[PDB]
Write a protein that binds this ligand. Structure first.
Ligand SMILES: Cc1cc2nc3c(=O)[nH]c(=O)nc-3n(C[C@H](O)[C@H](O)[C@H](O)COP(=O)(O)O)c2cc1C
Length: 149
């Protein structure tokens, strides 16, 4: 039975709420999930022989949240290649602007630039018109969790 590192990138907690639901769903299906609200390469590392998943957002001029910048730089510069990494991605932000989920999209790109192999398609939550993001992400995690071991 699989184990899932559930790495988070936020400055306001809305993507973190979805990550806590994602951990609960995978745990209920039977997989040993673990959510990380303040992650590091040291917590990403234990899952390269396994599976991982991302729940992230956007900040500044369209940059990654500072809570996941040290994970994004760490994997980019001190890991470099991941041909056997398997995962899934949820991204969350405001639809009112051109950088729609651009910080979460950069974290999916962190893994495709390293030859990882996602077990699904990236979910894009529009918080400014979607005040119940659980309803946009729970059936997505329940589905993705059937594609594990
Ligand atoms: C400076 C700034 C600009 C933002 N502009 C965007 C944007 O262009 N695209 C987007 O998807 N999210 C954007 N966001 C994210 C919003 O804050 C959004 O309301 C989000 O849901 C906040 O919750 P989160 O951090 O948990 O995701 C921006 C955040 C900040 C700090």
């Amino acid at each position: 039975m699989a184990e899932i590192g559930i790495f988070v990138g936020t400055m306001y907690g809305n993507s973190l709420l979805v990550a806590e639901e994602a951990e609960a769903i995978l745990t209920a299906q039977g997989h040993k999930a673990t959510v990380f609200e303040d992650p590091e390469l040291s917590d990403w590392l234990p899952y390269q022989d396994k599976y991982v998943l991302v729940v992230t957002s956007t900040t500044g001029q369209g940059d990654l949240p500072d809570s996941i910048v040290p994970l994004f730089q760490g994997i980019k510069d001190s890991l470099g290649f991941q041909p056997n990494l398997r995962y899934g991605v949820i991204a969350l932000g405001d639809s009112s602007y051109v950088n729609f989920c651009n910080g979460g999209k950069q974290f999916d790109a962190l893994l495709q630039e390293q030859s990882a192999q996602r077990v699904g398609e990236m979910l894009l939550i529009d918080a400014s018109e979607n005040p119940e993001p659980e309803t946009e992400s729970n059936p997505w995690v329940e589905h993705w969790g059937t594609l594990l071991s």
